[PDB]
Amino acid sequence: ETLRVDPTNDRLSALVEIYRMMRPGEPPTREAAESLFENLFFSEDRYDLS
Amino acid sequence: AAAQVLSSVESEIGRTTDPVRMYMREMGTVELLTREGEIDIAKRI
């Protein structure tokens, strides 16, 4: 059901949706969205579970 | 061709109020006109 209610269809559109939720108003790009999502949880500097 | 993306952006902004974002969108409209461009512009002056 969640997949059904999900308007996104590919990786880039999901990354853009992430960008627009995190940085509303800013027109997202490929590299900006990719860097933002990667730095969210998959960067050892901006994320530590400990 | 930058206002044709700003159209969708402003139609789908996240109710933005920060002047940093508004400025950084509009200064980004105009592209880097340097080197040869700058000399041509300097001659028009």
Automatic annotation (TrEMBL), chain B:
Coiled coil: none annotated. It is found in: Cytoplasm. It comes from the Bacteria. Belongs to the sigma-70 factor family. RpoD/SigA subfamily. Sigma factors are initiation factors that promote the attachment of RNA polymerase to specific initiation sites and are then released. This sigma factor is the primary sigma factor during exponential growth. Interacts transiently with the RNA polymerase catalytic core. This is RNA polymerase sigma factor RpoD.
